[PDB]
């Protein structure tokens with residue numbers, strides 16, 4: 001009927017050679033060879049266009065049909081070349097990109113093109129079910145070419161029926177793909193929408209001649225039929241006669257590096273940290289400079305200089321575990337697990353979103369409630385115990401050789417390992433120097449080093465996930481910390497003994513008993529909700545409440561303590577890695593006055609403390625003691641301590657608090673919706689709607705705490721034991737990974753054994769974990785020593801790191817030292833110990849009953865013998881498998 005529809009009919013009529021002739025005939029294209037090589041490798045610093053679309057947006061804006069600015073939203077970012085070109089534009093200030101990804105379709109690619117620091121991308125989003133947000137510039141490249149116009153219409157109509165919802169929130173500029181603009185209903189609807197919102201339709205000559213695709217843009221204005229018939233006419237004419245010459249152009253070069261951004265950070269207290277700053281400058285005045293392109297909004301930028309790049313993302317596999325776990329090759333939750341990206345790139349692309357936040361400054365009423373609760377808790381904790389100056393002797397008592405230097409200055413660059421330094425009086429001479437400066441009120445050396453952590457974590461986009469930041473200080477400063485405050489860890493101030501709610505020291509064996517005991521106490525449901533990125537949410541006021549313990553010290557101890565707190569905690573100076581433009585890599589120095597780092601000596605202590613403060617506050621709001629205006633200012637202060645000294649311990653012993661994570665059993669269900677003080681402090685609940693009621697639980701076995709939910713089991717004779725559990729796939733994945741680069745197969749086998757005896761010790765109740773662990777200890781020589789680290793949890797002491805037999809260690813930890821089990825009879829054989837319930841083992845990730853696990857289970861000894869052969873025969877193996 002129409003000039004377009006006939007062209008489509010003809011296009012379908014054709015054959016393959018005519019297809020080829022027409023498709024490329026006489027359009028413009030870009031030199032994409034450079035780019036496709038850079039994509040083959042993934043050279044982020046090249047600064048090349050990740051897709052074709054970057055040119056399409058370039059043409060649209062440089063010709064002047066689009067006026068992009070401010071907050072930009074890319075719908076269907078795909079690779080993200082639209083977003084990546086957006087980043088470059090002078091007036092843009094934030095780029096959000098949404099797409100689907102998953103099986104078959106494109107996932108977002110990550111590069112270091114100019115302004116990448118404002119690019120937040122996400123996948124797994126069927127934007128139809130996503131709500132609208134107020135963008136300044138709206139982009140949508142969502143089309144889906146097909147043969148029949150029947151579908152082109154329907155799909156473009158679905159697209160528009162979606163994007164209207166967004167458009168009615170008045171974007172300053174917009175560009176949306178319109179696949180099918182050539183039919184009756186389409187011309188109609190496009191005319192109506194052009195009337196009701198403006199804009200105009202433009203055809204890009206870069207696009208292939210095989211579709212009628214057009215773009216709907218803000219800056220232009222034109223009648224629909226007129227442009228549609230221009231495109232239809234030219235498309236038709238191009239068909240017959242000569243195959244007209246293609247036009248070559250060069251692809252846009254995006255540049256590289258970061259972009260200048262809103263600097264809304266708090267100004268620094270120059271005389272606390274100035275000594276450290278100007279020391280660093282005096283050291284590196286060779287190449288010292290101030291980069292104008294900084295991606296940091298909340299940190300005070302103090303300068304940068306050239307440095308060498310650190311870490312990598314490469315991830316090695318432990319063939320022992322893998323070849324023993326062939327049937328798990330299909331599950332994504334296992335194969336997708338890999339290393340964390342600890343390059344400056346991978347550090348920063350987590351930093352800029354997770355770490356670069358500034359918390360809502362809580363109101364004076366919540367401020368006063370926090371200081372009150374913290375004062376009461378400092379009183380009640382320091383009743384039995386009292387502080388003390390910790391000694392050099394105890395420091396070297398604790399120390400072992402595998403800790404980190406923190407090599408910052410020249411004077412500290414002598415040693416290589418800890419046990420070497422600790423026995424050299426030069427070290428302690430410098431410690432005494434920094435101490436006698438601290439007592440005078442000047443900080444010279446206590447400076448933070450920072451890099452991303454090496455973790456085994458889920459892969460995102462089918463790629464290495466970004467590394468969360470870890471920052472710690474040089475060892476001497478850690479000694480100052482320890483002598484001042486380390487007594488909190490040493491004397492077990494957070495132990496359940498003294499505290500009641502804390503569990504400082506208790507291993508993963510015992511904690512379930514705490515959960516059951518808590519469950520026997522009557523009340524409402526059990527409520528465990530994880531706080532979103534705890535460390536970054538800590539405010540000045542929380543730190544100043546944690547400094548109140550100094551009330552109970554003596555004057556020397558308080559002098560050193562407050563010195564270290566103020567010049568260290570409440571004013572922090574950091575050295576961080578950033579990747580510069582065109583390859584080179586640099587070090588930046590920044591400061592701030594809130595949050596806490598995971599490399600502080602009393603991280604666990606302080607976190608558990610203020611977390612207890614928060615849980616107390618939430619129980620006060622839940623049980624209606626805190627009224628709704630007391631956020632603003634405190635009415636009847638007294639009635640806080642009236643409650644605390646009536647029920648404070650009574651509620652406290654209904655808590656299990658471990659640093660970041662928490663578990664509570666309140667009196668009634670109102671705790672589920674007493675979120676307002678919780679929100680005011682800035683301690684939001686992770687990835688749940690900020691104001692929605694909390695998901696509680698009834699049966700205590702299904703409570704997750706420190707990534708584990710605990711289950712009770714009766715022995716085959718009669719006694720009862722409590723064991724920790726989690727999802728199998730996580731542990732099999734963790735085992736698969738090899739932390740070290742360039743490691744001989746020996747130490748990878750050592751790791752494999754470490755994991756094996758970890759499973760035997762802890763997750764024996766899992767059929768596949770016991771099976772595979774016995775297979776590992778069998779196929780691995782029982783000679784060799786277990787080395788490496790398994791799961792970073794502090795509640796794993798390291799009890800499986802010895803060639804001792806695991807039956808005896810099992811008896812020791814689960815019976816002989818088992819304080820919650822009276823009957824001391826050590827059971828003599830493995831297969832007496834029961835597995836978990838079949839339905840629950842299936843639920844937590846087991847593959848029992850399925851044919852891969854059957855086939856692999858029957859051929860276990862063939863594979864194990866193959867492992868022995870590949871390692872090297874005539875080494876002392878042992879066949880643990882009996883059954």
Ligand SMILES: Nc1ncnc2c1ncn2[C@@H]1O[C@H](CSCC[C@H](N)C(=O)O)[C@@H](O)[C@H]1O
Nearest residue numbers: 051053076077078081082099100105106141
């Ligand atoms: N409704 C939807 N929401 C998000 N992504 C979608 C989608 N429908 C398709 N996609 C995926 O997202 C991509 C959109 S096209 C990619 C173009 C990209 N914006 C660029 O700058 O070059 C497609 O490859 C498709 O696989």
Ligand SMILES: [Zn+2]
Nearest residue numbers: 443444445446
């Ligand atoms: Zn200092």
Ligand SMILES: [Zn+2]
Nearest residue numbers: 725726840844
């Ligand atoms: Zn379980």
